[PDB]
Amino acid sequence: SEYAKQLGAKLRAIRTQQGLSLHGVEEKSQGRWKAVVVGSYERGDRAVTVQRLAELADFYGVPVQELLP
């Protein structure tokens, strides 16, 4: 729970850092990443899979390790 919490704190830190809001992600990604889904990752309310995390890190353009708590 705490881990999920802190993981989502970084998922948010990277997203906002490149100036994108949650709606921004859904739009730029042509709908592959739904704001709803990404938000729930950022609040630790929904658990991302390691696979899925790997793709996000790619979409954002950062080393996937960096998103780990």
Residue numbers in the entry: 3 to 71
Article excerpt on this structure:
BldD is an 18 kDa DNA-binding protein consisting of two distinct domains connected by a flexible linker. BldD sits at the top of the regulatory cascade controlling development, serving to repress expression of sporulation genes during vegetative growth (den Hengst et al., 2010). Specifically, structural and biochemical analyses show that the second messenger c-di-GMP activates BldD DNA binding by driving a unique form of dimerization that is mediated by a tetrameric form of c-di-GMP.
Our data and those of others (Lee et al., 2007a) show that the BldD DBD alone can dimerize at higher concentrations (≥10 μM). This structure contained two DBD dimers in the asymmetric unit. These data indicate that the BldD DBD is unlikely to form a stable DNA-binding active dimer at physiologically relevant concentrations. The DBD-DBD interacting surfaces observed in the BldD-DNA complex correspond to the hydrophobic regions near the DBD C terminus that interact in the apo DBD structures.
